[PDB]
Amino acid sequence: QEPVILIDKIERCLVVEWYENNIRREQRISYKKYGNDKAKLRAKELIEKLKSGITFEQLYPDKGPPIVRVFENVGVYNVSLIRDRIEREWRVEWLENGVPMKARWSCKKVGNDEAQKRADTFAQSMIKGIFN
DNA sequence: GGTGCACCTAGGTGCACC
DNA sequence: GGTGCACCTAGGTGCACC
Domain boundary among A20, A35, A59: A59
User: Coil, strand or helix: which one is A123?
Assistant: helix
Resolution in A: 3.1
A8 with A53, same domain: the answer is yes
Terminal Cα-to-Cα distance of chain A (whole angstroms): 44
Distance CA A3, CA A129 (A): 39
Distance A115 CA to C4 C1' (A): 20
Are A92 and A122 contacting, i.e. CB atoms less than 8 angstroms apart? Answer: yes
Are A49 and A59 contacting, i.e. CB atoms less than 8 angstroms apart? Answer: yes
A39 with A71, same domain: the answer is no
A110 with A82, same domain: the answer is yes
A122 with A74, same domain: the answer is yes
Cα torsion A44, A45, A50, A53: sign: positive
Query: By residue range, what is the domain housing residue A47?
Result: 4-59
Distance A123 CA to B17 C1' (A): 33
A13 with A50, same domain: the answer is yes
A45 with A97, same domain: the answer is no
Of A21, A30, A107, A117, which Cα lies nearest the Cα of A62? A107
Determine the protein residue whose CA lies at the shortest distance from the C1' of C4.
A108
- Assess whether A62 (CB) lies less than 7 A from strand B: yes
Chain-centroid distance of CA A121 in Å reads 17
- Give me the number of domains chain A comprises: 2
Q: Which nucleotides of B are covered by protein (CB under 7 A)?
A: 2-7, 11-15
Chain-centroid distance of CA A90 in Å reads 13
